[PDB]
Amino acid sequence: SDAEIIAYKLETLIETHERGVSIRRQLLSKKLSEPSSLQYLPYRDYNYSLVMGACCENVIGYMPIPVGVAGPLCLDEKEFQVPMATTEGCLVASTNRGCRAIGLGGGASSRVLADGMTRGPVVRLPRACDSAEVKAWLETSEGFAVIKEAFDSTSRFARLQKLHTSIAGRNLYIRFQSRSGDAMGMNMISKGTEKALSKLHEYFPEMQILAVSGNYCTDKKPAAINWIEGRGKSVVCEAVIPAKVVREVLKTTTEAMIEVNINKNLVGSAMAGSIGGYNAHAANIVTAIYIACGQDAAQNVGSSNCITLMEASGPTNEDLYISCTMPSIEIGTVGGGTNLLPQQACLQMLGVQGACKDNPGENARQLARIVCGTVMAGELSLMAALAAG
Amino acid sequence: DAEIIQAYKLETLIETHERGVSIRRQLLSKKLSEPSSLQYLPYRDYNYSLVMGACCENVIGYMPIPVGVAGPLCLDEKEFQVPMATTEGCLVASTNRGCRAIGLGGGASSRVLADGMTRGPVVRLPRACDSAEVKAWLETSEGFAVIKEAFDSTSRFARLQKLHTSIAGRNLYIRFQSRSGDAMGMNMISKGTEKALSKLHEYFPEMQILAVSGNYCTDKKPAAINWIEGRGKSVVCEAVIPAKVVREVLKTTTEAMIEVNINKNLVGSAMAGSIGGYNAHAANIVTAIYIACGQDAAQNVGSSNCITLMEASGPTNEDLYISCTMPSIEIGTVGGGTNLLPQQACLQMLGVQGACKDNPGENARQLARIVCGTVMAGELSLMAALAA
Amino acid sequence: PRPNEECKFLSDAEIIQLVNAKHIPAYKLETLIETHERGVSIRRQLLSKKLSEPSSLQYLPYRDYNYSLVMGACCENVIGYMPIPVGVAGPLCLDEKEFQVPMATTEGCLVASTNRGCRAIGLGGGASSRVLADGMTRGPVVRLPRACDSAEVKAWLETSEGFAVIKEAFDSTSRFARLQKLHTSIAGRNLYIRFQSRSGDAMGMNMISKGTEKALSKLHEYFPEMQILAVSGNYCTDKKPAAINWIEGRGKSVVCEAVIPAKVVREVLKTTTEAMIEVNINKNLVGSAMAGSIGGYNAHAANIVTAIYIACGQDAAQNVGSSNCITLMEASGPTNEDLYISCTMPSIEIGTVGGGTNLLPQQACLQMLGVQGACKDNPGENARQLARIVCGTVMAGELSLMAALAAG
Amino acid sequence: SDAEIIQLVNAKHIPAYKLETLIETHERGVSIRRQLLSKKLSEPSSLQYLPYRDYNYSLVMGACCENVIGYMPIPVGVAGPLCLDEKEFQVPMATTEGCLVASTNRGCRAIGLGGGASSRVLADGMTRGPVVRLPRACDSAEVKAWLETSEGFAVIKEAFDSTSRFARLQKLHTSIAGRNLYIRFQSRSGDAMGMNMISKGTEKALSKLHEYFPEMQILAVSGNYCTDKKPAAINWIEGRGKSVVCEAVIPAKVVREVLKTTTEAMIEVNINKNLVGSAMAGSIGGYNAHAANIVTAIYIACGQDAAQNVGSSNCITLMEASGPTNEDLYISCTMPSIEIGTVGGGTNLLPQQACLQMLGVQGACKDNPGENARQLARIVCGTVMAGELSLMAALAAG
Ligand SMILES: CCC(C)(C)C(=O)O[C@H]1C[C@@H](C)C=C2C=C[C@H](C)[C@H](CC[C@@H](O)C[C@@H](O)CC(=O)O)[C@H]21
Ligand SMILES: CCC(C)(C)C(=O)O[C@H]1C[C@@H](C)C=C2C=C[C@H](C)[C@H](CC[C@@H](O)C[C@@H](O)CC(=O)O)[C@H]21
Ligand SMILES: CCC(C)(C)C(=O)O[C@H]1C[C@@H](C)C=C2C=C[C@H](C)[C@H](CC[C@@H](O)C[C@@H](O)CC(=O)O)[C@H]21
Ligand SMILES: CCC(C)(C)C(=O)O[C@H]1C[C@@H](C)C=C2C=C[C@H](C)[C@H](CC[C@@H](O)C[C@@H](O)CC(=O)O)[C@H]21
Ligand SMILES: Nc1ncnc2c1ncn2[C@@H]1O[C@H](COP(=O)(O)OP(=O)(O)O)[C@@H](O)[C@H]1O
Numbered sequence A: 001s002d003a004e005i006i007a008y009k010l011e012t013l014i015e016t017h018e019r020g021v022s023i024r025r026q027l028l029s030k031k032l033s034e035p036s037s038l039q040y041l042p043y044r045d046y047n048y049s050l051v052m053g054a055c056c057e058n059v060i061g062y063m064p065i066p067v068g069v070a071g072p073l074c075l076d077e078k079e080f081q082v083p084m085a086t087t088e089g090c091l092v093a094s095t096n097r098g099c100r101a102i103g104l105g106g107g108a109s110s111r112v113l114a115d116g117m118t119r120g121p122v123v124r125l126p127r128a129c130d131s132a133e134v135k136a137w138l139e140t141s142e143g144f145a146v147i148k149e150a151f152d153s154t155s156r157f158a159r160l161q162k163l164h165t166s167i168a169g170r171n172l173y174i175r176f177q178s179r180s181g182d183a184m185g186m187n188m189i190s191k192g193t194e195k196a197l198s199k200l201h202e203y204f205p206e207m208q209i210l211a212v213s214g215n216y217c218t219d220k221k222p223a224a225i226n227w228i229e230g231r232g233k234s235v236v237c238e239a240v241i242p243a244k245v246v247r248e249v250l251k252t253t254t255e256a257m258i259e260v261n262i263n264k265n266l267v268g269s270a271m272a273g274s275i276g277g278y279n280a281h282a283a284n285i286v287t288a289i290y291i292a293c294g295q296d297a298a299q300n301v302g303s304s305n306c307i308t309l310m311e312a313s314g315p316t317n318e319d320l321y322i323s324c325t326m327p328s329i330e331i332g333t334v335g336g337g338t339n340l341l342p343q344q345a346c347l348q349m350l351g352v353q354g355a356c357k358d359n360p361g362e363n364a365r366q367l368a369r370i371v372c373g374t375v376m377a378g379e380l381s382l383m384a385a386l387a388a389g
Numbered sequence B: 001d002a003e004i005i006q007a008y009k010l011e012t013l014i015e016t017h018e019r020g021v022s023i024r025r026q027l028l029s030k031k032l033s034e035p036s037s038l039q040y041l042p043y044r045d046y047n048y049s050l051v052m053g054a055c056c057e058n059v060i061g062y063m064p065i066p067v068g069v070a071g072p073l074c075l076d077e078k079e080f081q082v083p084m085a086t087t088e089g090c091l092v093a094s095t096n097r098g099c100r101a102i103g104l105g106g107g108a109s110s111r112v113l114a115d116g117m118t119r120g121p122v123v124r125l126p127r128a129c130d131s132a133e134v135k136a137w138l139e140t141s142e143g144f145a146v147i148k149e150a151f152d153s154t155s156r157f158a159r160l161q162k163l164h165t166s167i168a169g170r171n172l173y174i175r176f177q178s179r180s181g182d183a184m185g186m187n188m189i190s191k192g193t194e195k196a197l198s199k200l201h202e203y204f205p206e207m208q209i210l211a212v213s214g215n216y217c218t219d220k221k222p223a224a225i226n227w228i229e230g231r232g233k234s235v236v237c238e239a240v241i242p243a244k245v246v247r248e249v250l251k252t253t254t255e256a257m258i259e260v261n262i263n264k265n266l267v268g269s270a271m272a273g274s275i276g277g278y279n280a281h282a283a284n285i286v287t288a289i290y291i292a293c294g295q296d297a298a299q300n301v302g303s304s305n306c307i308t309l310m311e312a313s314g315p316t317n318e319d320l321y322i323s324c325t326m327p328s329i330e331i332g333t334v335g336g337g338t339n340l341l342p343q344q345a346c347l348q349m350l351g352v353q354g355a356c357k358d359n360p361g362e363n364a365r366q367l368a369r370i371v372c373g374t375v376m377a378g379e380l381s382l383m384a385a386l387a388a
Numbered sequence C: 001p002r003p004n005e006e007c008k009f010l011s012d013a014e015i016i017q018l019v020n021a022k023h024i025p026a027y028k029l030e031t032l033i034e035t036h037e038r039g040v041s042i043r044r045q046l047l048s049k050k051l052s053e054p055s056s057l058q059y060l061p062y063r064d065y066n067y068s069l070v071m072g073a074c075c076e077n078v079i080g081y082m083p084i085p086v087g088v089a090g091p092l093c094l095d096e097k098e099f100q101v102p103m104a105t106t107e108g109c110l111v112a113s114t115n116r117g118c119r120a121i122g123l124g125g126g127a128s129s130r131v132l133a134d135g136m137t138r139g140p141v142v143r144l145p146r147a148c149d150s151a152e153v154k155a156w157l158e159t160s161e162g163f164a165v166i167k168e169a170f171d172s173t174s175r176f177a178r179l180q181k182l183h184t185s186i187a188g189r190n191l192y193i194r195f196q197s198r199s200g201d202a203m204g205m206n207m208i209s210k211g212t213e214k215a216l217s218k219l220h221e222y223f224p225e226m227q228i229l230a231v232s233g234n235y236c237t238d239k240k241p242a243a244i245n246w247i248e249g250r251g252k253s254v255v256c257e258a259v260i261p262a263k264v265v266r267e268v269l270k271t272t273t274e275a276m277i278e279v280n281i282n283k284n285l286v287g288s289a290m291a292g293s294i295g296g297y298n299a300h301a302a303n304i305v306t307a308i309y310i311a312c313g314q315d316a317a318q319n320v321g322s323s324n325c326i327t328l329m330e331a332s333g334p335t336n337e338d339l340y341i342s343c344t345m346p347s348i349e350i351g352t353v354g355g356g357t358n359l360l361p362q363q364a365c366l367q368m369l370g371v372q373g374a375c376k377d378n379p380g381e382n383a384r385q386l387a388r389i390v391c392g393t394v395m396a397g398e399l400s401l402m403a404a405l406a407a408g
Numbered sequence D: 001s002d003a004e005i006i007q008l009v010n011a012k013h014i015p016a017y018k019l020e021t022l023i024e025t026h027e028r029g030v031s032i033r034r035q036l037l038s039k040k041l042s043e044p045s046s047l048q049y050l051p052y053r054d055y056n057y058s059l060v061m062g063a064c065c066e067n068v069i070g071y072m073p074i075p076v077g078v079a080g081p082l083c084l085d086e087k088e089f090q091v092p093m094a095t096t097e098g099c100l101v102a103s104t105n106r107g108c109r110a111i112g113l114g115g116g117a118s119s120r121v122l123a124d125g126m127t128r129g130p131v132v133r134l135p136r137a138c139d140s141a142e143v144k145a146w147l148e149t150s151e152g153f154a155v156i157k158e159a160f161d162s163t164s165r166f167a168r169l170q171k172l173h174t175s176i177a178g179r180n181l182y183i184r185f186q187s188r189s190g191d192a193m194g195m196n197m198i199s200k201g202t203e204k205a206l207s208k209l210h211e212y213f214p215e216m217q218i219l220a221v222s223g224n225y226c227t228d229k230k231p232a233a234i235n236w237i238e239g240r241g242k243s244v245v246c247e248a249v250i251p252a253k254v255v256r257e258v259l260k261t262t263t264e265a266m267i268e269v270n271i272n273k274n275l276v277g278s279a280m281a282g283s284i285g286g287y288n289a290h291a292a293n294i295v296t297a298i299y300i301a302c303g304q305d306a307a308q309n310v311g312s313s314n315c316i317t318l319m320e321a322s323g324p325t326n327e328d329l330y331i332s333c334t335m336p337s338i339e340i341g342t343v344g345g346g347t348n349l350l351p352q353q354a355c356l357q358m359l360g361v362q363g364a365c366k367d368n369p370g371e372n373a374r375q376l377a378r379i380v381c382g383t384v385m386a387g388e389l390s391l392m393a394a395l396a397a398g
């Protein structure tokens, strides 16, 4: 009976997933200064089977995030209705206005420049001379192949690319980079890396593997390395907004937009000492789409890297040319939070849910292009509001 | 529903909020390649009244994020049950293990070092000589007083603490820093900044206000200025984990934890060219708590700034001393997403919901201390897993 | 060559043999030998043996140099001097004055290029400059038993009464030592304190270090458990790139500006205002952004800073932070024909008194600019003037290089 | 006579910088320029102490400097011997900062008594990062992809490699910013620092690229993506010039007797100053105590480009407790971007060639091109380590 059972060791004891959640809440309530705190924290009628043992632990319910829609987004001759999970007012409306200006401008074009999730472990040799020897070995075409072999043998999608190594005395940081089908790829690349390091330990028995991640990836921390070499998907997007569209939809001029972009996104960011933060609010857009689509929201740290550029275009130089370059969009359409039904619905809205069996990785690339496009719409709108004052 | 279809202004016309959403979902399905997708996106039985006109537009439903609990967190002689909204496996469990090690260690201590949300507008003058003149005026006690007088006149909770100005030729970037009670403060600081710039314009007519935000705040973009001068709440957290607790709960040694922290969080981050990213995964913890508590998750960019330090402690130097310093936690307990009931529930769990009537700001400071403490628990756990 | 027992005025070969035998270190040759140049000569001969090529030094000068000013002040184990070609760029029309700028360098085209830049500025009606801030810094690192204690010290240092006792201790060390403010940063139980103060006409490193040591003693009386780990915890920050110098400044923060008429851009610079602007934005702003630069938003300010620093006896290693600069260009005038240019340098570490400025040749270069030594009437004015000159010369240099990049 | 030549100039019929070609002797040209400059000064006798007599200006005029009015004497001191890679070096240091040479000398002493230092060159390649523009981001994206294929690379490599004897194009790193494309060219350059050589190779390579993409606009041969003489994370992360690492172990006894401190005190200072302190200051590549002091002193003495001390001084200094009882001091210095050369520029002058000869690296290495420059870079990293050891000890000893 309910009261007779009277934490994580609940789903294993009982049988029904919701029962265990309900018991944990009642248990928790006794340990709080306000037992009625959880009154308004919903938990009923939720599919906990997909969550248990894959996405969360010690579950006591779920947090509802308002989902809005911005669009249509005219990108690469297609139209997208973009789902955005946010609690910030004006965000969805503002982004929507941006999409409008792009559509009335003939749409936006985007390109995926690079694709590759990374993992940067740190190993240490007894002496720097030894670590230097390993670096040189890793750089020989013969040393690389054996490493790519041990790395690729862990998965169908594990296809190791370039190897970026860096030395700090007897320490050696190795940045592994590989595609990962339609998955964001963190778990996959970690597995490949472990196998690859094990193989390297056989050639250099004196090598000590200090940590599978030595912050050289770099994952969820700001880093110049992600900005300069990319991580995940590097994307670029562009569009031209007609002078009339800038005055009527955005309520400003091409000249004012350009002056704000240069002195805010370029000079202002420079004065603030920014690395990769040469935009107005890409993070707002990235975060909203990530939460709605089951992405890892903590990856918004590097995923939001962006340089927004604006310039006079057209016959009379009265048209607004805009481009957004995002070198490190960490994203996926398979695994993690994308395995849940509500987030899968948002992914389906964009036509990128799950794997693309015929062209592996295409769904994730499409999603990355959508994010870059939506960021551009968001940048257009906020810059206009700042310019119009 | 029939010929009602004959846009965002639905609840502006129709009666029920849930009906206005149902209809918006119907209008949208006609533009989708897979109209059946919306079937799994919930929307039923949710208080949209609090959302409409405040937190979101063009609403088509809501996204459920699994909420887990980590704790108890023994911090400043209190115990906290920490709500974490996440879809990443092992996160809540790992953080929970970290809390365990801290409690068995006698708990953690934290201090709020600074408190002040910022806004950094960019203005321009005719010549660099003029912008230099404005900078000099702004740095006098008389000049600051008038600016402060005008800034503080916009709110009861808006109190200008200082000004930091930088010029770039004829451009002048002014960083306004102010307390904001229990609110994260962006809107409040923006209002005060507009009023202050208006007053500055009266002293310098030839001044052009280019943008209320010139990226000098800096908001939601990585910037050395937030790391060096702070933004929102600057917090420091510490704890000592006994040798046996490291061995038994964390499954490693103090020596291995220290070697991993130095070569990963310090040297590794240095090699990667990081500014403010001298930690293992503070962003994971910050994000999870932010989503659960109705914070602005996009502020995870600067809020996650953290330097994790580990040292040998005790009589025999077998104990693990750990500290986490987070100079820029942007947080609040009133307004924005904290106005919604489910997120208010998570805030209530921590005893920091809404405004602290007695001492405005105490709830937000408490929440910031809780975040720094939870990050430290998270850092302990992940470093242990990496060392082992 | 007399025996060692028999051995001021002797034979060179005899001194050498004495050095080898009594194992006397070469650096004692100044306080053992008669004329200054002989001590050097002997050391050159002493070192000449250790070389795989004994005749290496043959072309390294040493004769006819004032070693008295150098010994015990600017260099040790002296074996001669390195001649750096000095060129002149000018006149530089700045703040309604004209300057003939000395530049020590071995890089071809630098002086010529900078000279062309000065020409364009003069024909443009000159340049205007302003000193925005002045204050050398030192950022020591101290430790407390706990983060809670370091937090307590930070709060204490932020009270008006706490700051006053520190300021009193700091200022009691020198006439020009005047503590301006305190920026304090915590990293767990560690506490980094950035001291900032004016220093008359001196660059001020030694002076600020002395003040800092005294102030930390006073602080130690209030917090006996405080451990002073290092008088410099890299929070100054001295001779290393750092966002803190860029954002808060160090030494002298300066801004310079000038408008180059379209006519002058076409004829002297061989390009257009539009091309210059496009190069500046995509190189100095966007390019530097893509490269992950902090404070390097310019074309080659380091070239100019270094050349003037070596010629004027400044500390050339300080070129690391001193070269921080953001170069901005934009359309100006009736028909947006003219080129508006500005250079903002937040951290020029400079001085006209002390260190290498005490030597005669570099004093000559300082005299050329009218800023040699201390300003008796207005302490610090000579150093501020020199900083303004450097910013102005950098702008001239930026104009010229940008033009060469834009044209061809 | 001089009086006559001066009156001719004050007639506007000669600028003043035409003297070397106008006159016969170089030194007299300098003398006349000095007299002319004197009348324009608020204090005419100010040049009194600026030397100029008896200096081989032939090697300078037309190659190293313009409008020459004399020379600036920089005191040269010697630090050593530096026990590095089983060799001994007497290191020349041009400086006006007191205690620098002495301090570095003490550092060398501690290293020698510890069994010497070992160093390795990890990478070698000068760079140039021009910026070009295409009509659209889609076009710049197409060029990036093209440059990434084997065909496009070989074509660019061939054109680059055809400009010089040492032009051997390696990796081609590229970055896009909308319709802008930044291309980082990297190549070895024998024993030369290589700026001019790489610039020449870059110009032709861009010509060849223009034939395949006629709509491409070459905005600047240098778009600050090299990056030359400005602080940049790209040089720290990918290197520029020579990447070097050096290491040594100092016995507990030597740390106590020579450095006047303990290994424990050293380690605590290094971590909290060079790592944590630099982190708090927001440094990129400045994880050392004073590598710039050593780099600058050696650069000036050896005819290097002193302005390159901006990136050349990038360094991470690491210290660790080593040995039987963990009382021995292990130290390492990693410098990813030492821009250096032993041929060309200021190294063409006799006085600086003398300093280079002192180290045995003057000019070209006939047998193995580049070896002299690599040796010099190793010497710089080693001397930096000796300098780091000494300053850290002084900071530790209170
Ligand atoms: C800070 C600028 C501004 C316009 C005053 C502001 O408050 O507008 C709010 C309220 C309303 C007016 C309209 C808006 C339109 C678009 C955006 C979603 C914007 C919020 C932007 C904010 O989330 C991030 C910025 O602070 C980044 C920056 O530009 O520095 C939002
Ligand atoms: C990060 C490498 C590692 C430990 C193999 C890993 O996969 O552990 C996973 C699974 C399990 C083992 C235990 C864990 C404990 C704590 C964390 C929530 C961790 C996920 C880390 C990830 O969210 C970010 C890191 O990649 C950041 C970094 O340390 O560079 C998580
Ligand atoms: C920068 C490339 C370029 C213009 C082709 C070049 O070789 O010009 C040389 C030779 C001659 C043409 C004219 C010049 C004019 C002005 C400067 C002193 C320049 C050399 C600058 C160099 O020392 C640093 C740059 O490389 C910095 C940058 O990236 O802009 C110098
Ligand atoms: C900053 C150190 C200290 C002790 C205050 C100082 O004045 O020592 C001077 C005088 C004497 C004591 C011994 C010394 C030994 C070695 C060096 C050449 C040092 C000058 C260092 C200075 O040129 C750069 C540092 O300031 C960098 C930093 O550590 O932040 C020099
Ligand atoms: N599923 C989980 N949910 C929450 N916390 C967990 C979970 N699994 C482990 N933990 C935490 O991690 C610690 C590890 O203990 P345990 O799970 O028994 O594993 P171990 O074999 O490492 O001892 C526990 O003290 C608990 O706080």
Ligand SMILES: Nc1ncnc2c1ncn2[C@@H]1O[C@H](COP(=O)(O)OP(=O)(O)O)[C@@H](O)[C@H]1O
Residues within 6 Å of the ligand: B155, B157, B180, B181, B182, B183, B184, B185, B186, B187, B188, B189, B332, B334, B335, B336, B355, B356, B357, B360, B361
């Ligand atoms: N204790 C409190 N602290 C802060 N704001 C409070 C408090 N009590 C009430 N408020 C109200 O809440 C407002 C802050 O919310 P909001 O306008 O959304 O701005 P912000 O962007 O700062 O959250 C204040 O202007 C004030 O009217």
Ligand SMILES: Nc1ncnc2c1ncn2[C@@H]1O[C@H](COP(=O)(O)OP(=O)(O)O)[C@@H](O)[C@H]1O
Residues within 6 Å of the ligand: C111, C112, C113, C115, C116, C117, C119, C267, C268, D017, D066, D067
């Ligand atoms: N050899 C040089 N030495 C010094 N300055 C030079 C030299 N060559 C050119 N300059 C500078 O460049 C400017 C331009 O002169 P020049 O190159 O002859 O072109 P033009 O005479 O066509 O304007 C001169 O006013 C001078 O400042």
Ligand SMILES: Nc1ncnc2c1ncn2[C@@H]1O[C@H](COP(=O)(O)OP(=O)(O)O)[C@@H](O)[C@H]1O
Residues within 6 Å of the ligand: C027, C076, C077, D101, D102, D103, D105, D106, D107, D109, D258
């Ligand atoms: N003027 C100097 N020139 C060169 N080296 C010096 C000088 N002063 C000190 N040293 C270095 O310091 C070492 C010894 O330090 P210490 O025992 O304090 O004696 P002292 O300071 O008299 O040399 C010497 O071996 C030498 O490397």
Ligand SMILES: Nc1ncnc2c1ncn2[C@@H]1O[C@H](COP(=O)(O)OP(=O)(O)O)[C@@H](O)[C@H]1O
Residues within 6 Å of the ligand: D164, D166, D189, D190, D191, D192, D193, D194, D195, D196, D197, D341, D343, D344, D345, D363, D364, D365, D369, D370
């Ligand atoms: N061993 C060598 N190493 C380098 N350069 C050499 C060598 N032998 C001859 N050279 C010549 O010297 C040139 C390098 O000097 P220079 O053109 O002044 O450029 P930099 O000073 O920028 O390296 C090479 O392009 C080549 O013509």
